[PDB]
Design an enzyme around this catalytic site. Structure first.
Site, mmCIF file in Angstrom:
data_model
loop_
_atom_site.group_PDB
_atom_site.id
_atom_site.type_symbol
_atom_site.label_atom_id
_atom_site.label_comp_id
_atom_site.label_asym_id
_atom_site.label_seq_id
_atom_site.Cartn_x
_atom_site.Cartn_y
_atom_site.Cartn_z
ATOM 1 N N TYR A 27 0.822 -1.198 0.000
ATOM 2 C CA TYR A 27 0.000 0.000 0.000
ATOM 3 C C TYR A 27 0.857 1.249 0.000
ATOM 4 C CZ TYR A 27 0.990 0.827 4.966
ATOM 5 O OH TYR A 27 1.629 0.987 6.184
ATOM 6 N N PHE A 37 2.022 9.799 3.188
ATOM 7 C CA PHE A 37 2.361 9.712 4.595
ATOM 8 C C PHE A 37 2.827 8.337 5.032
ATOM 9 C CE2 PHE A 37 -2.125 8.809 4.444
ATOM 10 C CZ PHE A 37 -2.226 7.704 5.244
ATOM 11 N N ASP A 38 2.593 7.293 4.239
ATOM 12 C CA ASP A 38 3.048 5.965 4.640
ATOM 13 C C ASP A 38 3.028 5.077 3.411
ATOM 14 O OD1 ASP A 38 3.744 3.785 6.242
ATOM 15 O OD2 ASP A 38 1.681 3.462 6.964
ATOM 16 N N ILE A 57 -7.642 0.812 9.857
ATOM 17 C CA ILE A 57 -8.802 1.692 9.901
ATOM 18 C C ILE A 57 -10.016 1.027 9.269
ATOM 19 C CG2 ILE A 57 -7.545 3.827 10.149
ATOM 20 C CD1 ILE A 57 -7.783 4.207 7.070
ATOM 21 N N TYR A 83 -9.064 8.378 10.680
ATOM 22 C CA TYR A 83 -8.595 8.858 11.972
ATOM 23 C C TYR A 83 -9.422 10.001 12.562
ATOM 24 C CZ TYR A 83 -4.595 6.022 10.641
ATOM 25 O OH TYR A 83 -3.778 4.971 10.277
ATOM 26 N N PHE A 100 -5.674 5.585 -0.427
ATOM 27 C CA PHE A 100 -4.709 4.502 -0.418
ATOM 28 C C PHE A 100 -4.733 3.764 -1.742
ATOM 29 C CE2 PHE A 100 -3.438 4.159 4.069
ATOM 30 C CZ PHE A 100 -4.446 4.865 4.703
#
Lengths: 108, 108
Positions: A27, A37-38, A57, A83, A100
Site C-alpha cells: 500500500y 504519509f506511509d 482503519i 482517523y 490509499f
C-alpha cells in the site's frame, strides 16, 4: 461517507477476503492533496493484517474486503472511517480524507 | 477529561513554554495498561515540536505548557485530548487514555 473503492488493475474476480483471513498487501497512503504519509512499498516489505481484527482503519476493513486476490485498487476513505477529528497529529491532520493505493497479493 | 499533569522531578519553576517556542523533550508513551507504544528515549534522540502548531496531541499542547524547563512529569491524557474514538488502529485502541512520561530539556 465511508470508503469508496475504484479499481486500478484486476484480481481474480473470485477470491475475496473473509473474516479472520490475513490479507497480505502493498500500500501507499496519501493525504487528500497527494502527499504520501506511509507506504509499505518504500519499506520493500508487504504489510499483513487480519480482516476483522480492527488493526487497520475501518475503511480498510470494509474496502479491502471488496477486493479480489491480485486486485490493485484505490480506496478513498472519509475521516469517520479513518482517523476522525483528532487525526494523528504530525502525520494525519484533523478530519482528513485519505487515499490509499492497495494491492492484495494473497490471503493467508 | 483533558490532561492531568503530575510531577516526577522539578524544573526551574520559572520558564514555561510559550506559543511558538520549540519544546525539546524526551518522552515515553504508554497505553492505560502500561504497554509502551512510543518512546524518544528508545531512539536515543530527543523529540522537538513547536507549541501551538498542533503537531502533537492536544494533551501535549496544554500539558507541556504547564511544565517548567528541566521538569519531568507524567501526563495522563483522556481520549478526547489524544486520538479519540478512532484511535490509531494497530497502535492506539479506540477511546484510549494515554500516559506519557515527559522531560522538558530546553526551549528553542
Amino acid at each position: 461517507m465511508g470508503v469508496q473503492v475504484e479499481t486500478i488493475s484486476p484480481g481474480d474476480g473470485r477470491t475475496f477476503p473473509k473474516r479472520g483471513q490475513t490479507c497480505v498487501v502493498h500500500y501507499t497512503g496519501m493525504l487528500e492533496d497527494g502527499k504520501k504519509f506511509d507506504s509499505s512499498r518504500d519499506r520493500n516489505k508487504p504489510f499483513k493484517f487480519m480482516l476483522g481484527k480492527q488493526e487497520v482503519i475501518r475503511g480498510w476493513e470494509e474496502g479491502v474486503a471488496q477486493m479480489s486476490v491480485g486486485q490493485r485498487a484505490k480506496l478513498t476513505i472519509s475521516p469517520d472511517y479513518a482517523y476522525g477529528a483528532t487525526g494523528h497529529p504530525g502525520i494525519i491532520p484533523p478530519h482528513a480524507t485519505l487515499v490509499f493505493d492497495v494491492e492484495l497479493l494473497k490471503l493467508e
